[model samples]
Target: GSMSFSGKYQLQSQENFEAFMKAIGLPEELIQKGKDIKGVSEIVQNGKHFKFTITAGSKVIQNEFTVGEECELETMTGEKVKTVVQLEGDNKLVTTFKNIKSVTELNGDIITNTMTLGDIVFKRISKRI
Candidate 1:
């Protein structure tokens, strides 16, 4: 019928927010405040080209890239890094930045984002909007 990855999602809940923020190297004070605010993302996908816009608190991160191509992306810490994003099993988008890994998978109307930094696993779940 139609593509699945193109949609708008609102952050509904998260786990290990503080720990994940710390893992991303945010300041304690900033992390303390950032741990509560939810974020929103809208994905526009066209074949291998994808555009993502994320807004959390006072920061907005926009990332555009193609599968298997190296592209510069901004992280939660606002650090710009070049990385290659991949698609797996027709459902998940995977990427790694600054040694941190993020996997976003689509299931029904729910979006599950799993992030890994060292030994910490931060998961954020979003609902379709």
Candidate 2:
């Protein structure tokens, strides 16, 4: 089977998002403000290169990376990290930042993102828009 993840997706639901943010060292006010923000993720895949755009509140974050290559990434909280994002199996994208690891799975019309910061996990589910 194959999966095509290039599309616009809207945040549908979240599980343990606040706790996950807290685990990742996000401040209380930031987390509180983020709770009500509806996140929109735009993904564009051109062969091995991937472009990601995430918009929430008044901020728009964009990133471009090639698969299997290490790239510099800046976190929303102004932290810089180097990581590589690889497509795993058929429908999963995986990456790690410091102690945090994230796995995004594409399942039909739904996209599930799971972030793990050590023992704490945060999950965000999105649907095609």
Candidate 3:
């Protein structure tokens, strides 16, 4: 992975947010509450280690790890999921947990995250500040 992963980004748009959350087992009420909310993501890559901070409304999740090492990471719903985040070719991060797979692809200053569980795919796109 030669691309830089350091960026402060905010949620700009998303698709199938509600359906995806429902399929992932998030409570209905919780999904309804945050379905319209915007989230921010910050990633700091140092050497082989990385720090990922996700801010969803008033909640902030602190997740850090080194590439290739299996580690527990806090997921979108603030749940800790055991998984290893993989770096793809030039500009992608991949991870899977609870039958759901994710791919975060970076292009220029924009970040595109796609989480897929069967036919229900959630896509959240964020842009650097």
Cα lDDT for residue 110, candidate 2? 78
Reference-based TM-score of each model: 0.76, 0.81, 0.76
lDDT of 1 at 27: 81
Which lDDT values do the candidates have, in the order given?
0.72, 0.76, 0.73
Clashing pairs in 3: none
Q: Pick the candidate with the highest lDDT.
A: 2
* Model 3 CA deviation exceeding 4 Å by range: 1-4, 25-28, 74-80
Better of 1 and 2 by lDDT: 2
User: Residue by residue across 16-79, what tens digits does model 2's lDDT show?
Assistant: 7778777768887878888877777778888778887767676677789888988988877688
Candidate 2, after superposition: displacement of residue 100 in Å? 1.6
lDDT by residue (4-114, candidate 1, tens digit) is 567676678778777876775778787776656656667778876888776677666666788798888766555788877887876767787656667767788777776
Candidate 2 regions exceeding 4 Å error are 1-4, 25-28
Count of backbone clashes for each model? 0, 0, 0
